[PDB]
Amino acid sequence: ARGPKKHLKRLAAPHHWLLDKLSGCYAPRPSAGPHKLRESLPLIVFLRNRLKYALNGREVKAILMQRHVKVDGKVRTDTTYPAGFMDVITLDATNENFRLVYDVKGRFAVHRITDEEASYKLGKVKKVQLGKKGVPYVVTHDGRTIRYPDPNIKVNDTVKIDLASGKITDFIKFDAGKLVYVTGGRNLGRIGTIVHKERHDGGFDLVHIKDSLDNTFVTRLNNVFVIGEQGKPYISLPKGKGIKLSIAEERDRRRAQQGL
């Protein structure tokens, strides 16, 4: 005890980093940042383990100490910088703009995007308050404070951020008939067009969702994240589109898909 932990062991790290456990030793502890420890992805993991551009932490550091890579238009030469959901990673090598999104199994899908799409990102407003001198502000999921927004931006709406100016271009309300990208939970990575909402004062508001295959399900509103209207997302979605083809369908695919 006696102050905060600085280490993190292999087996304690979230399962969606995919490394190895039994006395494999240590894992990269995300530094404090915009995102939470578990719902985040450090750059060392994004670069050594997913993209295979590097093989070692010193290689990753050699990369990061050259202003090559930037998160949200800013360099972030920290090794264990917690990058998270809907975060834009930009490498001038290959001019590859990486959006961190979720695949359907719950891992961090490595989405490649256009520069015009990397221009912006999205943010779920967590609270709307008045600050000092009567100045209203909204707080997003990525710890971004934005002053003097549209007064119609109420809580759980989502917001389009221009990422160079921390300003708001357009907002999307929380209502029925709106797309959703589930963040957190069993049903993580699914995309399903809110059916309706269940209030439960003092009791964790629930949301009922319906995939394109009419596979209805239910999640928690803290885990819901809106992204657009029916059939008009605001982001390039990954390969899979959040459907969760069952294991049977998956084997039927990878047996009939391809004899390789």
Partner: protein
């Protein structure tokens, strides 16, 4: 991250007869090898027992039973004529030992004995 187990009665001459016959037929140095095949076969049998207790047209049954059947077929233990998840229970140590390589060398020729094949 480790595994294996062995039998119950250390004697019972009928078993000794059967085991030594298999050992002589298939060129084995130990009873541990027969025990190993019986262990594998027991795992398979109890898996299939659970699945058969499950409902027909049940997703876990279909998935895991087809998988188990596919594995045994591609090994050649389960013939492709009997592919229904009951001969998986009817299997036997002879049917596994026949697919061992030593036995396959001999039956394919090329060694004129199972002991020569092992060597």
């Amino acid at each position: 991250s480790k595994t294996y187990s062995t039998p119950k009665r250390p004697y019972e001459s009928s078993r000794l007869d059967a085991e030594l016959k298999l050992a002589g037929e298939f060129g084995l140095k130990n009873k541990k090898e027969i025990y190993r095949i019986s262990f594998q076969l027991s795992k398979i049998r109890r898996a299939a027992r659970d699945l058969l207790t499950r409902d027909e047209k049940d997703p876990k049954r279909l998935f895991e039973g087809n998988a188990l059947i596919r594995r045994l077929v591609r090994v050649g233990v389960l013939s492709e004529d009997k592919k229904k998840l009951d001969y998986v229970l009817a299997l036997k140590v002879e049917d596994f030992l026949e697919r061992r390589l030593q036995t396959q060398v001999y039956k394919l020729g090329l060694a004129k004995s199972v002991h020569h094949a092992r060597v």
